[PDB]
Amino acid sequence: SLAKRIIAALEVKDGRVVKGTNFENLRDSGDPAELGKFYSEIGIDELVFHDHTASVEKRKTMLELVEKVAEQIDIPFTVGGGIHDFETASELILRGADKVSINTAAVENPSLITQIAQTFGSQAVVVAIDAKRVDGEFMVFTYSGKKNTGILLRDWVVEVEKRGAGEILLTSIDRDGTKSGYDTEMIRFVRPLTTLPIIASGGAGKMEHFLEAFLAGADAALAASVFHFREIDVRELKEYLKKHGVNVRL
Ligand SMILES: [Zn+2]
């Protein structure tokens, strides 16, 4: 069966992890680079950083983050949060990120996907798609879930692959922040529409949710607070998944 990845998401601001972690062993539980290194050592496959720094310092702050993280880890990492053009994405990849996440800017200018891919390869471009049910249809939302674009998820997935994206980070707004489970109906809906790797995001609460997401056709599963606050142990999770037939890296 197909190889599956466990991904930790770190929300960051001003070079700090927002709300930190429960990991007492670390010198500084809010240092993104230290936390990243720790996650790679306990068995996380990749990292996603999402930045919320204020506009005047944002560009420099995200570049510093990327350089510091790149020195501490050899596993892939993605950076995102307000990447609106090619030059911003380029500077971040050159400074050390393996991949960039784009969402609002991709919907507003789908050629941005192609532009980044032309220089850095499709594998450098993660399109984050936030979606929610509206009147029985899956719709795409932008601006941190504030705007219903009126674009069907079905149509956007196909366009994203056509434009040259390498991966889709699929967040169910219906589940994000809850610990109720991944939106497996949404994952199953997207799976036949694309050949791209799908990162399931939103709703992780317990180890069984990961199994469910992988059965639904996710290639990777992303989570944040379940790991940060140690509700789920990463090694225990991989051992659980392997036991039940999922091809994870031990
Ligand atoms: Zn964020």
PDB file of N, CA and C and ligand atoms in Angstrom, residues 11-12 50-52, ligand 1:
ATOM      1  N   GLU A  11       1.880  26.879  14.197  1.00  0.00           N
ATOM      2  CA  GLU A  11       1.442  28.255  14.003  1.00  0.00           C
ATOM      3  C   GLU A  11       2.488  29.148  14.664  1.00  0.00           C
ATOM      4  N   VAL A  12       2.973  30.144  13.934  1.00  0.00           N
ATOM      5  CA  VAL A  12       4.054  30.993  14.422  1.00  0.00           C
ATOM      6  C   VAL A  12       3.729  32.471  14.264  1.00  0.00           C
ATOM      7  N   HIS A  50       2.950  28.084   9.635  1.00  0.00           N
ATOM      8  CA  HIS A  50       1.975  29.072   9.168  1.00  0.00           C
ATOM      9  C   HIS A  50       2.170  30.324  10.014  1.00  0.00           C
ATOM     10  N   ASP A  51       2.592  31.414   9.362  1.00  0.00           N
ATOM     11  CA  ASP A  51       2.992  32.654  10.055  1.00  0.00           C
ATOM     12  C   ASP A  51       1.895  33.711  10.083  1.00  0.00           C
ATOM     13  N   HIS A  52       1.823  34.411  11.224  1.00  0.00           N
ATOM     14  CA  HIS A  52       0.823  35.440  11.515  1.00  0.00           C
ATOM     15  C   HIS A  52       1.444  36.767  11.976  1.00  0.00           C
TER      16      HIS A  52
HETATM   17 ZN    ZN B   1      -2.345  30.050  10.735  1.00  0.00          ZN
END
